[PDB]
């Protein structure tokens, strides 16, 4: 079935250059147009460029025209987008997609996207900090605990609880860009107050950018 994958995104420094790629299965890109649509973080869907792999014709969005090159190689069934003089404005998730043509110029299949972050900022991984119960009051019924993932660059981090076995009442919030240009997030979990001491709560924090894998055991205190 019609599948479209994308790859090679990551942190680029401004003015750098990247090459995202898009590997089409289930169809021959030859007889279709291929489109690169992007989406900045928390904004809408921007079109960047299209290719007709067969006569190779292209069309670009003005924001992009001249700095970016969409090409396609039909023998590899892959299409490519070459980004040059990358501005911070180019930080977006990038989706390729196609126009079936037969019946419609709608964009029926799309890929999963790839995060391209354009920044001057060096990779830094998470310091992981416990958010512990019973800080004034011990009794209640349902207790809450979490882990505070602080100061990492770029996105993402992945928070799990007790190696994926505690999936209930787990709330990992949206990340927040700090004044510092670095991210933070909290992952929280609600549990019974009977179990505190009968059970270990441990969060697992994977920053794949810095190759960080922290495990913190969130356990209680008195004051």
């Amino acid at each position: 079935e019609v599948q479209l994958v994308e790859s090679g995104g990551g942190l680029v420094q401004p003015g750098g250059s990247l090459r995202l790629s898009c590997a089409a299965s289930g169809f021959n890109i030859k007889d279709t147009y291929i489109h690169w649509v992007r989406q900045a973080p928390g904004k809408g869907l921007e079109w960047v460029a299209r290719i007709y792999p067969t006569n190779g014709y292209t069309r670009y969005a003005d924001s992009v025209k001249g700095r970016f090159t969409i090409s396609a190689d039909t023998s590899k069934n892959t299409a490519y987008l070459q980004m040059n003089s990358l501005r911070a404005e180019d930080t977006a998730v990038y989706y390729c997609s196609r126009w079936g043509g037969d019946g419609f110029y709608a964009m029926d299949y799309w890929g999963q996207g790839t995060l391209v972050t354009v920044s001057s900022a060096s990779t830094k991984g998470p310091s992981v900090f416990p958010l512990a119960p019973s800080s004034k009051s011990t009794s209640g019924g349902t207790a809450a605990l979490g882990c505070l993932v602080k100061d990492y660059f770029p996105e993402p981090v992945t928070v799990s609880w007790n190696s994926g076995a505690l999936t209930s009442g787990v709330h990992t919030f949206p990340a927040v860009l700090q004044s510092s240009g670095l991210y933070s997030l909290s992952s929280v979990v609600t549990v019974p107050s009977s179990s505190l001491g009968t059970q270990t709560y441990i969060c697992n924090v994977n920053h794949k950018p810095s190759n960080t894998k922290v495990d913190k055991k969130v356990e209680p205190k008195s004051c």
């Binding site: 869907l45 079109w47 709608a106 349902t142 979490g146």
Partner: protein, 214 residues
């Protein structure tokens, strides 16, 4: 560049409700508008192409209309799994432009926050900083007012909230305010208080603790 204006910007509609989103073409775009679904953190999906026709595998409770240069997506009987952002698109000229999106969030019975405050861990406090955290768990509507009092004197801009997308099972949102400050200023004050205002609470709940390291 024909501009697809799209209204509303978001809507609370209840399960079973008929919902209607419009996208007004800024130039006649004929019949060349497709409509898309965006479930959070995911690739766009086609629902309707060239105004009217559903994609294969799109539930018939979805439907598209044309009336000049106004285009309508209708969900007859809104299901709880239609929590998504819908996008409209004129694919008439180049560039293909999109509408600004309409978030459709499910309405349900006004629930109240379970508030929890958390002191700074001293592994952080060592590093010369202090993030005091306030949790507001499983409430609805999304709106709410967290309010940091530090020995009663509430604070200006030094707190930052983040909020959950609404849950899939119980349509509630969760949210956290994180007041962060230097291990120095932190230690000037004794009492650290969070004051939560919401509809689900007749009275503002105040969660607090006395300054740690004890």
């Amino acid at each position: 560049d024909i501009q697809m204006t799209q209204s509303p910007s978001s809507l609370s509609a209840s399960v079973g409700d008929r919902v209607t989103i419009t996208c007004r073409a800024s130039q006649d775009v004929n019949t060349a508008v497709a409509w898309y679904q965006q479930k959070p953190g995911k690739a766009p999906k086609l629902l309707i192409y060239s105004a009217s026709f559903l994609e294969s595998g799109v539930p018939s409770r979805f439907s598209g209309s044309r009336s000049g240069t106004d285009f309508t997506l209708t969900i007859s009987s809104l299901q709880p799994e239609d929590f998504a952002t819908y996008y409209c698109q004129q694919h008439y000229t180049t560039p293909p432009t999109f509408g600004q999106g309409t978030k459709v969030e499910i309405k349900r019975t006004v629930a109240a926050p379970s508030v929890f405050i958390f002191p700074p861990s001293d592994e952080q406090l060592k590093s010369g900083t202090a993030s005091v955290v306030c949790l507001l768990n499983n409430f609805y509507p999304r709106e709410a007012k967290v309010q940091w009092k530090v020995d009663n004197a509430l604070q200006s801009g030094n707190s930052q909230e983040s909020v959950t997308e609404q849950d899939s099972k119980d349509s509630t949102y969760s949210l956290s305010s994180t007041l962060t400050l230097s291990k120095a200023d932190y230690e000037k004050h004794k009492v650290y208080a969070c004051e939560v205002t919401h509809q689900g609470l007749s009275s503002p709940v105040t969660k607090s603790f006395n300054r740690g390291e004890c």
